[PDB]
Amino acid sequence: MSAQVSLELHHRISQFLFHEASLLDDWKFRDWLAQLDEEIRYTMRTTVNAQTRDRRKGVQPPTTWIFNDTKDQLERRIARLETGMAWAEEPPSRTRHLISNCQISETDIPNVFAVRVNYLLYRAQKERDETFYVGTRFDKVRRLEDDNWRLLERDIVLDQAVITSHNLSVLF
């Protein structure tokens, strides 16, 4: 297995992820944006069904992007939200993040850690609209010299082949 972290490091990283999720839930988008590192890469792919022979050989049908964002892209989405003309988020949706199965492992890069969690995102919109997104997430966190952490990378997996929500206007 990988050279795992101690108790304190796991506690700190888990608390940092909890605080980030709370920031996303409390509609403090600028602070959440300030929590991210400069070189963030915020990706997400589709999911397909392959033939049994393809699965055994390791071959998969072609996929594509749903999210491919740098830090400026996320900034730009937030600034679109702040204008008040984003009719997709008027009124804003109310979301809750549940983070579980937190597994933390080291990396050969000094002071950069890899994290794998399972997430359940509950998105409730106005007047009886509910949606559940369930999946896994591979993040990376960098520790600065000021005892604070920054999100260096985030990879999201959504387990729906045919997404059942007309849009994804909320950040994962």
Added chain:
Amino acid sequence: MSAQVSLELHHRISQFLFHEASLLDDWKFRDWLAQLDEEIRYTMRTTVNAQTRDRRKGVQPPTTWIFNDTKDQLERRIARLETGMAWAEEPPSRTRHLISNCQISETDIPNVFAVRVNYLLYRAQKERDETFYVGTRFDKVRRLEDDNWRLLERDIVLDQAVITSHNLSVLF
């Protein structure tokens, strides 16, 4: 940030909340009642959609109560359950509590701690009735001199503007 607790305090408070949830799930209502402090305040409000100008100014449409209970009120609900004439709970519903994102912070009052969690309550009733409640909860816990904890306050947030269940006969 707030002066956070150490590892052991977080462990103890999280275990206490887990045990309370287990008591609510195992239909031991008298023991759960004995877990609460005398001055408990068990509240819950509604949720509304505001205009963009109202959101920016900080103005919100009027809200109301769904739960406003002291300890005697909760005792009285439990005693209503114990009579066997509560047709809303015959047969009793089977509920599961999932507690996540446990954030624990201190308070200026000595030996009283504040807790924020996210909760998923799964309520299954007889013959194919399921309901999911997802939200956040701001609790407070008091440590007694006997190394034991008591629930001093509980504030519940439900993210549905139009609740989709005909009643809430289960305690959160």
Added chain:
Amino acid sequence: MSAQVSLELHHRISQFLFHEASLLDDWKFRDWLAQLDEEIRYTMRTTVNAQTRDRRKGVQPPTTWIFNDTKDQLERRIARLETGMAWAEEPPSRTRHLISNCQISETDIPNVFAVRVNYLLYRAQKERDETFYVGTRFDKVRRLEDDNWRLLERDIVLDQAVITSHNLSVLF
């Protein structure tokens, strides 16, 4: 209360359960099988609605089995999966395990621990098929002399009286 474990033991057992769940999610069935102890007992019962008098007396209507597996039975199911002729799992379903409310207690047997968790299993199949299973699980873990853990027993509780999925082709 029971003589609870320290922080480190809880951390280790929780990490072991997380890794097992990840193995089940990553479609590494042989490794998951190698994680189990020889004398595993993997059971699951039905759930019924009783009369108020029956509930007070402690009487319950008769139940039955849904899972009653030894280690060879689980091996045999995995080997059925590996043949590629299991039309119920072509294409395989994508599942996620969320483990919460981890309570760990000792047992009079040396070096065998009892664990109680709440679980949410999200099973998504091809092209817009989703299913949620919510419940509790009473496991037991044995610590070997090689610092590694083995699943000695697993008891699963499903809170649906009338199961709403045509089959349970995925392991809990």
Added chain:
Amino acid sequence: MTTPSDLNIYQLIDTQNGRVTPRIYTDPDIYQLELERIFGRCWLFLAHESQIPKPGDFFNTYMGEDAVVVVRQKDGSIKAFLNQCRHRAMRVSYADCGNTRAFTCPYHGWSYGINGELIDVPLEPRAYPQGLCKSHWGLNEVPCVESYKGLIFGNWDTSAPGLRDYLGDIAWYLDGMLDRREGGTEIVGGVQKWVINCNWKFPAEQFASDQYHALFSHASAVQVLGGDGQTARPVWETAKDALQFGQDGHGSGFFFTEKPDANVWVDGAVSSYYRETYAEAEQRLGEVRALRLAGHNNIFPTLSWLNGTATLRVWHPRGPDQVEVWAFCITDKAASDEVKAAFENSATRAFGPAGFLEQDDSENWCEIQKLLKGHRARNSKLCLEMGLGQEKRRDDGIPGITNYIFSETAARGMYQRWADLLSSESWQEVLDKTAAYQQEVMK
């Protein structure tokens, strides 16, 4: 296609002998005919005048399944518009309440004034070279809106009788709650909204004609709930007389009393306030309506309320097997802040989604709806025979058609009204049929 021609409503209701067929709670063509003829012509509750006090204030509600916006004009009046744009039928307003100067469609950008006029079409000279007549493309206005002592009632039709003529004698019993003091009434603190999986006729019938159910359904609440002085025991134990009024689909019922005592559920401060203001209430209304502080009322189709608890409810149909509940807590405008807080606490504790008493009612309605799926469970006659043949008119100052409290004159009248509305085209024929039925019931 929905064709009412092969439907025969009268075969499912027998108001003479008191029988009913449970199919009416499930048939979907019945529900479509209801949406066309019941909610399309009868007066419906919109909002209380204290929620739109100033010009430009609006409130978003429903009239049937239709979204409606109620807005206060610039001269003081009130108007109601169908919440739908004239270009692709987009929703123009989304909030619950607030102040606005114009409704702007978010899809293309058409803008309307608070009086429903079209004031801005972007790029009119280019997009409409032949000219667009902005007068014909104003918002859809409800032709009939009228306020009664603070409650605003709207109606889609124009051949219906006025609000006063439509209410008839139920106004006498409604004044007992609206007209207790000087200065009217007002809403306190928000609206409670939830969903119950039952046909809309069950709660209407229960709140129009059922006080009987309170003997056995709410027995646990009576045992457990019953620090200022509240009622010693439930009223039906010690009451000397009783009365139930049922007419034109409206229903009311209560127990006579010797002192101004509400039910046992109300908080102490509410009872103290009622005892204090009994003198003024008697001065304005009289002896009977000032001692009336416990009972049930219902105005057809969907306006229900209770007296002592000070709770008002509106029932929005959502399909043939669902309903949405809107709940208001209304008090007297001349009260103090502490009394208003006590009223809010009492009402939300007693009759919310988690109140001791709504639990059982909702559970029972849902169970009936679940049972009604089968073919033999919706083709078996039921019993509406309670108190049949005992209808009389009092002569001591209480108007209408009366009976003992444990009877079903109100429910039979409501079902006859519903079947008469479904089976007739013009309102005049409805009135004639109802007059004939009321002639028959007394002989």
Added chain:
Amino acid sequence: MTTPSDLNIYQLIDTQNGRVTPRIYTDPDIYQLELERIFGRCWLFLAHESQIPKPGDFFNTYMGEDAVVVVRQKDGSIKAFLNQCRHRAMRVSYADCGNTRAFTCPYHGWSYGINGELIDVPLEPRAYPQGLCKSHWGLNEVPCVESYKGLIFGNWDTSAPGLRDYLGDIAWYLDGMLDRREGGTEIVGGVQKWVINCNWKFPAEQFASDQYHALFSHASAVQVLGGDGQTARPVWETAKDALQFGQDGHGSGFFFTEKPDANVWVDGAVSSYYRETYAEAEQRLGEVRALRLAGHNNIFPTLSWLNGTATLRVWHPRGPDQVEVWAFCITDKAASDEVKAAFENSATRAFGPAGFLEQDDSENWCEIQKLLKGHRARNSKLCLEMGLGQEKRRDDGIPGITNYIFSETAARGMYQRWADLLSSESWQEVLDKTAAYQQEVMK
């Protein structure tokens, strides 16, 4: 409104040439006509007599989509009542099984005796001054309930043939499982309930006429599953002869054998028990029915079972695109506790919601139902031509209409029966049409 007049059932089924149109699995008016004419007249399985052994014991089941309660009387007999009160149609019983002395409606409080009589109406003298006749307001009773060797069958109609005349020749094959020993049979340990998103006709047709599917659907289970001696290999490999009986909608099928061997799935102790009791089974039944320990059977419409595994199933329709499965594990009453535990383990391991064999069947039915949404996927003819024109009557002591095991005489007969029941008013016409069809099939 549902009008069967424009429906033409006979155009969707061609039993002479063996073709079928897949629309019948989707049409909702077809489903309503089914609920009216198939489940409203045919005998339906209620429960086993070992689940209501003592007076006052009850069991909650369904007859179609209707909730039904089956209760054992005081003199020893058994009755079945529609689970619905006579006042607002509230559900009177909610548990699965138990002992009771009266059914109490939780909404108002009407109470009924275990024989369906109304014994207590609260406040009758006040609420019903003109008098209520308690005799007319008893529970709705199923007019026809009859027990056969432990299985209780109920029927809503009264013009139908008796249970023996309705079963006909399928009783000969059912006795092979019910009448193996002395002392009858009994249910072991509870009921398994789940939901499959498919029309109810798919499992009925498969359990009536499909042994073919076991060659390719359950190939993985045969590979992997096949510590006392079990069967060496699946029976179809080594079997010398085969037989399928199909008549009046009932179906059965099995392989001839030389030794009392069940299938490969059964546990060793079950096979040892069958080998032990082969002598008594041969003494009671005969040579053919005592060696029959592997096959499939189905009684129209929804009673399915398998021989060796000792599993019984009931199929409750829930709409035109769902079904609910009730599963029983039935053994011989004279066995021991260890053998009963072995039977339970084998049955629940093999044919539960998580059994090796039900997986594929449920998956395939769900896939067919999902494909059937489109307009061209439900208007294309299918093939019912297996073994057509090879029907013969044996003369060695096995009755009925016979064929080779890989044929579809049973499915064609079932579809003809279903189309004849849907298209006829009285049972006499059903019998005449079935007699004519059986005359035609042999010539």
Added chain:
Amino acid sequence: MTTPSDLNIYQLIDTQNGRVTPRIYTDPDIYQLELERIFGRCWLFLAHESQIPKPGDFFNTYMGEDAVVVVRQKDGSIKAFLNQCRHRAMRVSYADCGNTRAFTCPYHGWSYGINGELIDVPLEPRAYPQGLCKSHWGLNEVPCVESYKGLIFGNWDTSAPGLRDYLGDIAWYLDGMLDRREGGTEIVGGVQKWVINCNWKFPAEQFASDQYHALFSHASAVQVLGGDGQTARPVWETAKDALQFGQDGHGSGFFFTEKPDANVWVDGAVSSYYRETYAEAEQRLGEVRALRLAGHNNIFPTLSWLNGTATLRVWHPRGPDQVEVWAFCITDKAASDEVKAAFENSATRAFGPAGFLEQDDSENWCEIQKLLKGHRARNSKLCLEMGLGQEKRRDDGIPGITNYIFSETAARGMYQRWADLLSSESWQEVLDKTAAYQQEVMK
């Protein structure tokens, strides 16, 4: 039963004056008639030829609500089969794409060749003693499949006009995107699939006739989004002229331009590539179609695309109140890998489920569908009067019926085509009615 006889489509559409009744987006019998007559006869997009390049390659798609498999033959041609077995209608293929040699039914085991012939029935000599004719039981084949410059169109009918005659003049505008370079076009990296809860007519009408909505719906995206040189500002600000073509249900629209500039959303490398290849594009097509790099197009019923962003969409109806979106990113086959990656990034960033522009469109369609539940919200006339009476034919090399970009000739033509197809049996009558309507529109 669905009977179109009592339906009257023409009363819900008024294309002469430009009015529409919103019931057409909700009526379920309308949806069934659509599935029978619109999608049953009109050409539908199957796949791009670059997804099935080699023999035996297949692709799983839909034609309406019907699952269809498109497979490349051994000689080079392409065939399409209804994805349904001939024995119980089981699904034979489940993957998205791949290479195969035979389709094997997983239920019983019938096997088909990649050309639809039945090649293996297990145990034919036993199960079918009288003989089975394998020729009549082949897969259901789409009688009309034809490829146009890389896009494969299928049709269930055979009396319809050919693909070229059916496309008509929209081919002139489609060549502007398909025929820019030498070597055709190709799909880049997978398909995006999701579900929107709206009737399928809303996106078709928007992509056929709405550029107006981009002024106010996508204002936030214009503000925020607008490192190689992109467009300075949105085209409608600086454009000198504009054009919208609407005919036979097909629609197109764009702004004239002086330099090869796409919209502001596209990445810099895409614009650089277009500027580079402008010379070749002008050489092949001409001046007008080589400068056209921003606009909207739609081929009836469900083939939508945009020019500059290089995005193509297909709209599968799922009931009267849902639709499923399939999204493709198509580029030029002669480009490089870096340019292809830039195209993929731009298209998925701009028009995915999470793209800046699809958000508002989906939200607005869903809101309209939610509002349409009520009885008065679906019986109120709307306004289709934009640019009415200004239709003219250009004479500078652009064919068809034209108008200014902010008009609704295309939407009115589409609705007339839809109402003509629903109300006529044979294609000849459709053509005659459309010819008469096009004669009327000019006079």
